[PDB]
Amino acid sequence: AQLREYHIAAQLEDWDYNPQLTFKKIVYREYELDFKQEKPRDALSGLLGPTLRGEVGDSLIIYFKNFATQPVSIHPQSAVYNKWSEGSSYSDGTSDVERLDDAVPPGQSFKYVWNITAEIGPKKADPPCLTYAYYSHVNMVRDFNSGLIGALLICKEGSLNANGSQKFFNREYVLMFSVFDESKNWYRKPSLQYTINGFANGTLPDVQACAYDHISWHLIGMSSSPEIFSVHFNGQTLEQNHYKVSTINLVGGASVTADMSVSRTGKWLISSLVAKHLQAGMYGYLNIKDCGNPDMKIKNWEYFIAAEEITWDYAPEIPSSVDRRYKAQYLDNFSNFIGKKYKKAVFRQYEDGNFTKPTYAIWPKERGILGPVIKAKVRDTVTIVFKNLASRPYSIYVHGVSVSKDAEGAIYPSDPTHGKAVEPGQVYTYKWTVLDTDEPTVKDSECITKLYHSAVDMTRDIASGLIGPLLVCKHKALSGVQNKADVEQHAVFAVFDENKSWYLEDNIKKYCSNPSAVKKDDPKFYKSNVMYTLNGYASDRTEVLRFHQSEVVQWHLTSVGTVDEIVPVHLSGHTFLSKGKHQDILNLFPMSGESATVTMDNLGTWLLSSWGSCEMSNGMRLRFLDANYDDEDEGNEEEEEDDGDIFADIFIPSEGNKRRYYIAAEEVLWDYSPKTTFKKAIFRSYLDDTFQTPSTGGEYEKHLGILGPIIRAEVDDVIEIQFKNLASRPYSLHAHGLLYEKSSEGRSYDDKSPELFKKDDAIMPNGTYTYVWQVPPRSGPTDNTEKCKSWAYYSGVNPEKDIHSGLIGPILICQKGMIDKYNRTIDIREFVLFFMVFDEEKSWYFPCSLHTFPAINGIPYQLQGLTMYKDENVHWHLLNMGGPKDIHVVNFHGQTFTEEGREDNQLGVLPLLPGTFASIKMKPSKIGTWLLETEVGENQERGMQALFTVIDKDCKLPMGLASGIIQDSQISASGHVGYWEPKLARLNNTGKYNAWSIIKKEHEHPWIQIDLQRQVVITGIQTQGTVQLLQHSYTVEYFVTYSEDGQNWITFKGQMHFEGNSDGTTVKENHIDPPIIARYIRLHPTKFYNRPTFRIELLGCEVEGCSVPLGMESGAIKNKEITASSYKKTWWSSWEPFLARLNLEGGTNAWQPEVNNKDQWLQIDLQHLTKITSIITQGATSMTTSMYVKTFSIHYTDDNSTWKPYLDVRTSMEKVFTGNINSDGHVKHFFKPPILSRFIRIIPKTWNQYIALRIELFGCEV
Amino acid sequence: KSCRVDNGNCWHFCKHVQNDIQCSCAEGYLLGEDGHSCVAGGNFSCGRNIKMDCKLGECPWQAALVDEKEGVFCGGTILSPIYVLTAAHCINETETISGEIDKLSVDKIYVHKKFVPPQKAYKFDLAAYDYDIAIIQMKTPIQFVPACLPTADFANQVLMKQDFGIVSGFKSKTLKVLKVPYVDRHTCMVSSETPITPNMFCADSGGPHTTVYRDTHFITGIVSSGKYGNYTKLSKFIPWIKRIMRQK
Ligand SMILES: *[C@@H]1O[C@H](CO)[C@@H](O[C@@H]2O[C@H](CO)[C@@H](O[C@@H]3O[C@H](CO[C@H]4O[C@H](CO[C@H]5O[C@H](CO)[C@@H](O)[C@H](O)[C@@H]5O)[C@@H](O)[C@H](O[C@H]5O[C@H](CO)[C@@H](O)[C@H](O)[C@@H]5O)[C@@H]4O)[C@@H](O)[C@H](O[C@H]4O[C@H](CO)[C@@H](O)[C@H](O)[C@@H]4O[C@H]4O[C@H](CO)[C@@H](O)[C@H](O)[C@@H]4O)[C@@H]3O)[C@H](O)[C@H]2NC(C)=O)[C@H](O)[C@H]1NC(C)=O
Ligand SMILES: *[C@H]1O[C@H](CO)[C@@H](O[C@@H]2O[C@H](CO)[C@@H](O)[C@H](O)[C@H]2NC(C)=O)[C@H](O)[C@H]1NC(C)=O
Ligand SMILES: *[C@@H]1O[C@H](CO[C@H]2O[C@@H](C)[C@@H](O)[C@@H](O)[C@@H]2O)[C@@H](O)[C@H](O)[C@H]1NC(C)=O
Ligand SMILES: *[C@@H]1O[C@H](CO)[C@@H](O)[C@H](O)[C@H]1NC(C)=O
Ligand SMILES: [Ca+2]
Ligand SMILES: [Ca+2]
Ligand SMILES: [Cu+2]
DSSP, rough: OOOEEEEEEEEEEEEOSOOOEEEEEEEOOOOOGGGGSSSOSSSSSTTTOOOBBOOOOOOEEEEEESSSOBOOOOOOOSSOOTTTTOOOSSSSSOOOOTTTTTOTTTTOEEEEOOOOOOSSSOOOTTTTTEEEEETTTTTTTHHHHHTEEEEEEEEEEEOOOOOBBBBBEEEEEEEEEEEETTSSSSSSOOOOEEEEEEOTTTTTOOEEETTTTEEEEEHHHHHHHHOOOOOETTTTTOOTTTOSSSSEEOOOTTEEEEEEEOSSSEEEEEEEEOHHHHHHHEEEEEEOOOOSOOOOOOOOOEEEEEEEEEEESSSSSSTTOOOHHIIIIISSTTTTTOOOOOEEEEEEEEEEOOOOBOOOSSSSSSSTTTOOOOEEEOOOOOEEEEEEEESSSSSOOOSOOOTTTTTTTOSSOOOOOOOSOOOTTTTEEEEEOOOTSSSSSSOSSSEEEEEEEEOOSSHHHHHOOOOOEEEEEEESSSSOSSSSOOOOOOEEEOOOBGGGOOOHHHHHHOOOOOOOOOOOTHHHHHHHHBBOOOOTTSSSSSSSSESSSSSSEEEEEEEOOTTOOBBBBOOOBOOOOEEEEEEBBBBBOTTBBOOEEEOSSSSSSSEOOOSSSHOOOOEEEEEEEEOOOOOOOOEEEEEEEEOOOOOOOOOOOOOOOOOOEOOOOOOEEEOOOOEEEEEOOOOOOOTTOOOSSSSOOOOGGSOOOOOOEEEEEETTEEEOOOOOOSSOBBBBBEEEBBBBOOTHHHHHHOOOGGGGGGTTSBBOOBBBEEEEEEEOOOGGGGTTTTOEEEEEEEEEHHHHHHTTTTTOEEEOOOOOOOSSSSSOSSSSEEEHHHHHHHHTTTSSOOOOOOOOEEETTTTTTTOOOEESSSSOOOOEEEEEEEOOOOOEEEEEEEEEOTTTBBBOHHHHSEOTTTTOOOOEEEOOOEEEEEEESSSSSHTTTTTOOOOEEEOOOOOOEEEESSSSOOOOTTEEEOOOOSSOOTTTTTTOOOOOOOOOOOOSSOOOOEEEEEEEEEEEEEEEEEOOOOOSSSOEEEEEEEEEEOOOOOBBBBOOOOOOOOOOOOOSSOOOOOSSOOEEEEEEEEEEEEEESSSBBBBBBEEOSSSSOOOOBBBBTTTTTTTTTTTEEEEOBSOBBBTTTTOOOTTSSSSSSSSSOSOEEEEEEEEEOOOOOOOOEEEEEEEEEESOEEEEEEOOOEEEEEEESEEEOOOTTTSSOOOEEOOOOOSSSSOOEEEEEEEEESSSEEOEEEEEESSOEEEEEEEEOO | TTTTTTSSSSSSOOOOOOOSSSOOTTTTEEOTTTTOOOEEEEEEEOTOOOOOOOOOTTTTSSEEEEEETTTEEEEEEEEESSSSEEEEESSSSSSSSOOOOOOOOOOEEEEEOOOHHHHHHHTTTTOTTTOOOEEEEEEOOOOOOBBBBOHHHHHIITTTSSSEEEEEEOSSOOOOOOEEOOOOHHHHHHOOOOOOTTTTEETTTTTTTEEETTEEEEEEEEBBBOOOEEEGGGGGGGHHHHHHTTOO
């Protein structure tokens, strides 16, 4: 343990993205103690504030002083804080003491006290220290872009030295890849900078690291609008959480923790291998330098490859399928456009150094323009002999291999040549070995995917057609064939942009109509050249990639080219098996490959494609067959026909349960602000196949939002969805993950199935269908650890434009057995969240981007039903579906979650990628209202951000009907027969008339409203009638009806009706799983014996659940702290202000002032700041009259030692509460927004007799 | 696609018509008057067992290859009164070869023309025990019970899609039995250093590996070698067996 204390502060500074015009920014910076001399602060941190640390059990204080022009703040992505340290401002109904952190104006300061819990620590499978970001929550989009940003490190217990530096690693470096838009920086400037830690144009100070060291990387990508990176360290491989790599996938607002292991001396380059990033100059160096420190199956391979300037045609055998406007925009050579084929400079393999006879007869079949497929195990020594044959110089560069600078094969901007860039006719030989540090882990597949290209002008080199898959594998793939798998496949999603080739004019001055006017860069023209590919094929073809049935084909995907977005990808019936998980889709960060293993569990032809641009749709797709062998020809042949060979050598010498739903695509009007009101097509469940009787809403479904009904099942179960359209245009049901036949697919493509299997492709209005979907082991939970698997279901006709129109739904497959009496999961809390930036400009309903509503579940901001207890298992199924642009780094505030299946992986922030949906487990640690979110600036503030809530586990404590603490003036009924009153409807209440009871009629139903006079949490009711003797007259059944705004209220349904009493005394208790929260509640009885006899009591807790006796009555509060304005002491008896305790009888019971006036007060010192929520007031009895305060006020202490009256949020001046009406009576008063002071005074305004009272404060320790 | 949908609610072999769904039956069975029921056609119908050590009469089909010197070397499975199925590596490894659980002349024996023995698996770097399948033909008709032969489809999408299978693998003095769960193909391929071909599958060699259905018995595989146990995916060699049966 320990107490870490940093002195931080905001302040402007003249930052220059080039140190070799500057901009004034507001950034963090660690001033020394007392703010005396600032501090050293490394030259590498740049704009990035000072990096914070702190093991587990420690405690961090942050003395923040705002020397800025604006109100800043400090804010951690890790739940190591409370609402007085949250540093964020929303509707949390807390005390001005808990909003002091929310914002800090210029000159103002604040003490940020964080408690780095063990619940939020790295733990099992995570490294020593996890990476996190902090930053001004006030206007994040405006506050960050300014510079306010830093890095927090939630280290683990016992991983640090005094130095504060990590002990496991020889080195430690914080890298923040950030995009800054000064055009948003308060001091607005029209400029856009791509920087690492603030250093643009590759001026980031040289990093340093001896040779043979063990680095601990803590990367942090971030921006305002959706931004994705793919960091890379030349001739170096990392381990992104137990996974060997080389290209790190970081999104805007995410952090990365990896451990590298250098092995080759020399300065290496550090960049995000993205198109834009790389041209913006964003880069750095890993200046490794030796330092003396110390660092069969093997079959040194050997390849002969060469650069050949060929003529490549993306369009060979272009089949009908393709889109017309496509083969007219990109293919067809009409309009002076180059056409389909351009001049390329690809790779080719030979069998000998003579480079005469190639190792093939046709350019490989299926690997398009892809170069030779390299390969190697661990500890093997590959030997490549490169021979340039093209016009200009080229090179060979490999990934995921600790190549040496002598065999690097890359050109840096700081050079005049050592086999780095071979020339025409020239021959060079790269000789690198697969180190053990490059070896893939136990998690990785048999083979890790990787690439290789020329490092002369990498970007421009590749666009000219220099790419090739490279696989690194353990000691399995033996020969040199694969092992474990019956098919090694490759699907490189390359985007070649001619206008970035070296033959850009060799093509224009050849394939053009009149090159003369050829205007390179002329939009229409440019976009033409810049075409999309899959393995070099710029469109689907006539041939289909055919695989067998029940066989396991291992894929190797890798998005190369100049891709700027995240290239997603899709299958069908079949699913990828990535990182030990199943996924019907795979997002590909540019330049970092992934190796899945999609087994053929389903037969029939299917489509594979990336769905995004009207360009990505066709430029990157293909079909694949999946069938047996069948028949046979032979058996039938013999039977009716002509038998063949036997194929044998002779010899003998020797002396699940069903499940059906009734969905329907209805039409609705939707406005995202209950002109914000649009028409949309939605779903909705019906009671049965009759329809017209849509199933009604429940409490839980009060959050689903737009999402259709929850299609839930268990493994091996079969689903029978009786979908039926009901809209203007035809729609369809497509289901992810599940095993659906060609009759239950819901998509029209070159499928070879007949019209019999096409009828599901789309259903025009009124159309009616049935989708029999099947849940096989590979569609549910993988391993016991996991509980429920998540899947989506949307339109097939036109997914994107259909999914935007309001058509989408959730699918849940839980462990065989995990579903109770009525279709709901037991022992856990369940939420489904849809993170998507709807765009009514894409929806069909609206006049191959102004009306956007970055909202969750189609409800930006609002929503509801997010009430969960504290400590109770709550899961969160997250579903995203936007294009390549909507990444949604989801975040739970003050909470920390693990992702199901991986209970050993902490995180706390989870980038939700397009076409992704993973389940996480919650179990929150803090109570109250909290914001859930996207750390993505643009959306965060423009809708996408719903608030959730938590309630103290112990929230069923009697709430004041037995004790009355709830006035009889609060209980009312629709009417009562007899002397029976609503006022007398209390539990265990005795007397000739002890309850409330009316007389039922053929008229309306009777009710009894209970006003708590303020919103609270209820989780249980209790019932009974009174026994005269012969008959009891009690209620048999009933239901509830809460409402916070007096008159308008809803009905509870988790459910509709509750169990009544069995007699006229027995206490029947009921529970409410989805806790209710409202100012008012009602009980409408339906069944009864004799008459609706009712006396009751509520069971819940306060919204904040803080109300606890502070010690007045208990005595915990010493009478030394109990001050007073004056205590009357007569010669006989006096009342000292420390005699003011609740329920106190004995002697001179209470406290009354010598001088009775509106100037009196009772001050109760608590010494240390405590949270106050509710205070009861009593009276006193003695000789002449019994006294009590008729009314009163309340004063408290302020942030800076100054008295302040408890002003009202529902008025101008401090509320004046209504005191007691007697002597030995209670009257609990609550505080709209809790009080967080150390000094409470109570100024009596009206009183009976002589001001006397007994107090009992209520609050928590905060 | 009904057949694919719970097996066209069929008891045995569900097939396809253009808009139909043809229901068949195993050998020696009478199809359901319903068009799916399917029942035992005779008293010597295959599959019918009795409804550790496999009670005598429980494994009425199981077979035993007897060698003069080594005695019982391999096991087999009675397919018909004339031909019994065995493993390829079970033949020509012993000096000779010839309704009993307490520890018949062989006429002809068909060894699959593609079987790859260990030695030969070495000579051409090929899959060992690949096509480990063979069929023995008795000199005299055996007096009856045999196991039922399934169809590639039925075996692929219905039989091999079970929880566990029966492997009456016998060195005890009495017959043995056990249930082995069907393991994934990738699980299998990544669980052994030995590369398993698309002919095999994993979950005594020569014994029968049957998958049960509607109180019936269908031959699904046959003991191979060997971590899980390897079997010869009889799904791929259904037509090859019918070839030899349809002998005449
Ligand atoms: C050294 O110094 C630094 C780094 O060290 C380098 O300077 C920077 O260099 C990089 C890379 O070359 C540049 O990045 C590019 O910036 C441009 C500029 O766009 C800005 O303004 C846009 C608005 O412009 C108006 O006019 C245009 C055209 O008429 C309209 O389209 C607009 O609507 C406007 O009216 C604005 O849209 C841009 O984005 C803003 O808004 C978006 C919302 O979507 C936000 O995300 C952003 O945060 C931002 O607020 C931006 O503000 C961009 O246009 C470039 O992006 C596109 O082009 C890229 C190629 O460079 C490529 O990745 C994509 O095509 C990308 O997509 C965009 O453009 C496409 C058109 O083809 C559209 O289809 C698409 O929708 C999208 O709009 C790119 O990001 C920096 O600008 C530049 N900064 C400088 C110079 O100050 C320098 O290069 C280094 N030099 C050396 C020698 O090392
Ligand atoms: C679909 O067909 C049209 C709208 O596309 C509608 O046809 C109606 O059919 C119902 C019942 O047969 C009638 O009550 C209506 O009079 C018909 N037309 C209209 C305009 O109401 C109907 O919306 C759909 N069909 C059905 C059967 O509901
Ligand atoms: C270049 O190839 C030379 C060709 O001789 C032949 O090599 C034989 C082994 C066989 O592959 C034939 O097809 C070839 O035509 C070979 O002798 C050399 O080893 C190679 N290297 C040189 C000449 O430096
Ligand atoms: C009053 O009735 C209820 C029964 O649940 C409970 O408070 C208690 O049993 C009774 N009073 C007692 C026990 O003092
Ligand atoms: Ca706060
Ligand atoms: Ca279809
Ligand atoms: Cu936030």
